[PDB]
Amino acid sequence: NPNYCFAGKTSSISDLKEVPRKNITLIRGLGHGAFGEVYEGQVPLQVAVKTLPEVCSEQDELDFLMEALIISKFNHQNIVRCIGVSLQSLPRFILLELMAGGDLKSFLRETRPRPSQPSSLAMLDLLHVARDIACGCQYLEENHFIHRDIAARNCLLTCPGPGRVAKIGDFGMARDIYRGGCAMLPVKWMPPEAFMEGIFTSKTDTWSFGVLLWEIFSLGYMPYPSKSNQEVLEFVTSGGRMDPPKNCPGPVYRIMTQCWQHQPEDRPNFAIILERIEYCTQDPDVINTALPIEY
Numbered sequence: 700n701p702n703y704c705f706a707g708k709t710s711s712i713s714d715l716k717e718v719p720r721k722n723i724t725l726i727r728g729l730g731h732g733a734f735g736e737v738y739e740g741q742v743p744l745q746v747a748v749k750t751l752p753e754v755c756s757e758q759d760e761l762d763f764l765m766e767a768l769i770i771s772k773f774n775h776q777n778i779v780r781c782i783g784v785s786l787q788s789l790p791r792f793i794l795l796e797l798m799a800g801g802d803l804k805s806f807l808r809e810t811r812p813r814p815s816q817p818s819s820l821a822m823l824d825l826l827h828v829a830r831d832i833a834c835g836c837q838y839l840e841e842n843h844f845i846h847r848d849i850a851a852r853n854c855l856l857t858c859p860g861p862g863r864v865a866k867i868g869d870f871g872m873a874r875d876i877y878r879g880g881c882a883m884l885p886v887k888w889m890p891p892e893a894f895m896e897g898i899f900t901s902k903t904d905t906w907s908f909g910v911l912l913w914e915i916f917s918l919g920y921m922p923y924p925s926k927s928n929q930e931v932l933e934f935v936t937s938g939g940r941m942d943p944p945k946n947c948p949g950p951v952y953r954i955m956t957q958c959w960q961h962q963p964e965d966r967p968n969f970a971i972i973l974e975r976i977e978y979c980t981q982d983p984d985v986i987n988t989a990l991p992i993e994y
């Protein structure tokens with residue numbers, strides 16, 4: 700059994716909270732796609748159940764064990780909680796906080812303002828999501844953990860409604876690096892030094908957060924519209940940056956452009972990002988800006 704170190708503390712599979720299999724009930728599927736299915740479940744405490752295929756390799760097993768260790772060792776309101784694991788029965792389970800709002804990317808697309816739902820979303824809703832994730836990122840930063848794939852698809856919402864809280868919900872990329880190919884790398888979320896020299900720092904996540912911010916204020920569009928991975932790589936390496944999302948307030952766009960500074964030392968840390976998001980939320984001209992209504 701591999702050890703895991705976070706914040707200078709070491710943990711082992713023995714530290715994982717094993718939940719007796721008899722206490723766990725599956726309710727419905729939520730998704731598969733990526734390696735492993737996820738179900739809604741009960742332990743009555745409601746959970747999302749990530750499963751390990753019984754038909755897997757030794758490495759798949761170690762990967763699964765490692766993400767369990769990673770998530771269980773985090774303690775922050777904007778990172779999905781791990782209720783525990785069930786590793787002593789097959790298929791093996793990781794039990795997560797059930798985020799009823801689902802993933803952020805799908806939410807943004809599904810919840811875009813429409814003629815039928817003219818006020819489904821406001822600038823403040825987006826700013827609050829951005830703040831929430833930036834808070835999670837600041838926690839990772841101050842604990843020297845580099846996420847490596849901050850993107851809408853990896854964020855979850857506690858509920859569809861106005862009191863929703865956003866959290867980082869997937870750590871698969873970080874898990875892989877802790878221990879794939881070019882075409883699977885999240886190049887559209889990566890800074891120049893990352894995909895060139897394979898250098899990662901906390902400023903990597905700052906760049907990625909900029910792209911997430913664009914995803915949020917575009918209401919769930921794929922970054923760099925119409926560009927392939929290699930076109931983005933060449934575009935960004937040459938100094939190219941995304942335009943503002945439709946109707947995006949200037950102060951918000953400016954946060955994006957600061958996250959995308961070529962030199963990592965010129966990019967803000969998350970304390971500063973949160974400061975700037977806060978300032979945006981106070982500014983009437985920002986939050987009174989109407990989001991586009993999709994016909």
Ligand SMILES: CNC(=O)c1ccc(F)cc1[C@@H](C)Oc1nc(-c2cccnc2OC)cnc1N
Pocket residue numbers: 729730731737747749779795796797798799800801802852853854855867868869
């Ligand atoms: C299919 N998506 C994932 O597996 C997925 C994608 C990104 C991510 F960060 C975490 C997950 C899975 C591991 O965890 C969760 N998914 C949902 C959930 C996700 C999608 C739709 N409805 C849901 O709950 C009602 C809710 N809570 C979770 N703890």
